[PDB]
Enzyme design. Structure first.
Site, PDB file in Angstrom:
ATOM      1  N   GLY A 223       2.811   5.650   9.693  1.00  0.00           N
ATOM      2  CA  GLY A 223       3.905   6.215   8.858  1.00  0.00           C
ATOM      3  C   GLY A 223       5.021   4.857   9.074  1.00  0.00           C
ATOM      4  O   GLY A 223       6.076   4.858   8.430  1.00  0.00           O
TER       5      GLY A 223
ATOM      6  N   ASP B  23       0.086  -7.460   1.301  1.00  0.00           N
ATOM      7  CA  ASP B  23       0.629  -6.297   1.499  1.00  0.00           C
ATOM      8  C   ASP B  23       2.065  -6.213   1.416  1.00  0.00           C
ATOM      9  O   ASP B  23       2.733  -5.955   2.261  1.00  0.00           O
ATOM     10  CB  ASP B  23       0.175  -5.471   2.910  1.00  0.00           C
ATOM     11  CG  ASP B  23       0.694  -4.361   2.946  1.00  0.00           C
ATOM     12  OD1 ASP B  23       0.806  -3.563   1.950  1.00  0.00           O
ATOM     13  OD2 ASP B  23       0.341  -3.671   4.019  1.00  0.00           O
TER      14      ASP B  23
ATOM     15  N   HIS C  90       0.839  -1.235   0.244  1.00  0.00           N
ATOM     16  CA  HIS C  90      -0.058  -0.136  -0.033  1.00  0.00           C
ATOM     17  C   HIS C  90       0.830   1.160  -0.106  1.00  0.00           C
ATOM     18  O   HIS C  90       0.374   2.491  -0.317  1.00  0.00           O
ATOM     19  CB  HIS C  90      -0.756  -0.038   1.113  1.00  0.00           C
ATOM     20  CG  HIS C  90      -0.168   0.355   2.592  1.00  0.00           C
ATOM     21  ND1 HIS C  90       0.739  -0.900   3.310  1.00  0.00           N
ATOM     22  CD2 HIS C  90      -0.110   1.201   3.377  1.00  0.00           C
ATOM     23  CE1 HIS C  90       1.009  -0.312   4.210  1.00  0.00           C
ATOM     24  NE2 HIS C  90       0.648   0.917   4.509  1.00  0.00           N
TER      25      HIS C  90
ATOM     26  N   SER D 196       4.574   1.868   8.084  1.00  0.00           N
ATOM     27  CA  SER D 196       4.428   1.048   7.197  1.00  0.00           C
ATOM     28  C   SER D 196       5.792   0.557   6.548  1.00  0.00           C
ATOM     29  O   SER D 196       6.557   1.239   6.360  1.00  0.00           O
ATOM     30  CB  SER D 196       3.434   1.370   6.064  1.00  0.00           C
ATOM     31  OG  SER D 196       2.051   1.647   6.660  1.00  0.00           O
TER      32      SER D 196
ATOM     33  N   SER E 269       2.313  -4.135   8.056  1.00  0.00           N
ATOM     34  CA  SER E 269       1.375  -4.014   7.362  1.00  0.00           C
ATOM     35  C   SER E 269       0.487  -3.077   7.516  1.00  0.00           C
ATOM     36  O   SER E 269       0.338  -2.003   6.925  1.00  0.00           O
ATOM     37  CB  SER E 269       0.587  -5.341   7.158  1.00  0.00           C
ATOM     38  OG  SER E 269      -0.704  -5.031   6.185  1.00  0.00           O
TER      39      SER E 269
END
Length: 198
Positions: A141, A63, A36, A143, A159
């Site tokens: 943030g 993801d 993503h 991720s 994820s």
């Protein structure tokens, strides 16, 4: 620039993620991150500077993503740990109950324990399979956060989850909120990538 898992990077000056793991495929260098974070041919900017673009990614359903770096980028078998680094030794899975740490962006270096694995969760952007649940703090943030053991064993990349406007969900009791990340190994086999180790 040097490529270390835990170093923040932005996508198209929009999305906020962090470098997962340093990997290579043949003569192609890159790093592993979340899906993503951006789509194919999205601009990745490690350290606030263009270093390469997204090569491939899977969603929804997973993801995961692989970002292709330029030849000028140096792949280091390291994960950011404050002023220090964690040497990458392998990519084996830690047992449930084992303590694991990760390096994200906003919350940086956080640690916790594994409560469950092989989890499929339904996000607003679609479902993500192969998630591992831990007690490690999660914030926005983070991720692509680089999950790694003290033995230098890569676990996977962050994820996401039900993170609150307070910036995290780890202020919430673990019975209500937790952190999820997707196992690395699948990703390495997905794109045929070799993990950089030391």
């Amino acid at each position: 620039a040097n490529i270390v898992g835990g170093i923040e990077y932005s996508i198209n000056n929009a999305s906020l993620c962090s470098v997962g793991f340093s990997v290579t495929r043949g003569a192609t260098k890159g790093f592993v991150t979340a899906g993503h974070c951006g789509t194919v041919n999205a601009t990745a900017r490690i350290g606030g500077a263009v270093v390469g673009t997204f090569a491939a990614r899977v969603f929804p359903g997973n993801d995961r993503a692989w970002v292709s770096l330029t030849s000028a980028q140096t792949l280091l078998p390291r994960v950011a740990n404050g002023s220090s680094f964690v040497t990458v030794r392998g990519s084996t899975e830690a047992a449930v109950g084992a303590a694991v740490c990760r390096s994200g962006r906003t919350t940086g270096y956080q640690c916790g324990t594994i409560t469950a694995k092989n989890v499929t969760a339904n996000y607003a952007e679609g479902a993500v399979r192969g998630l591992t649940q831990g007690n490690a703090c999660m914030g926005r943030g983070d991720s692509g956060g680089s999950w790694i053991t003290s033995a230098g064993q890569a676990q996977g990349v962050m994820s996401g989850g039900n993170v609150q406007s307070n910036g995290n969900n780890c202020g919430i009791p673990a019975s209500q909120r937790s952190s999820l990340f997707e196992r690395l190994q699948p990703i390495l086999s997905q794109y045929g990538l070799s993990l950089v180790t030391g």
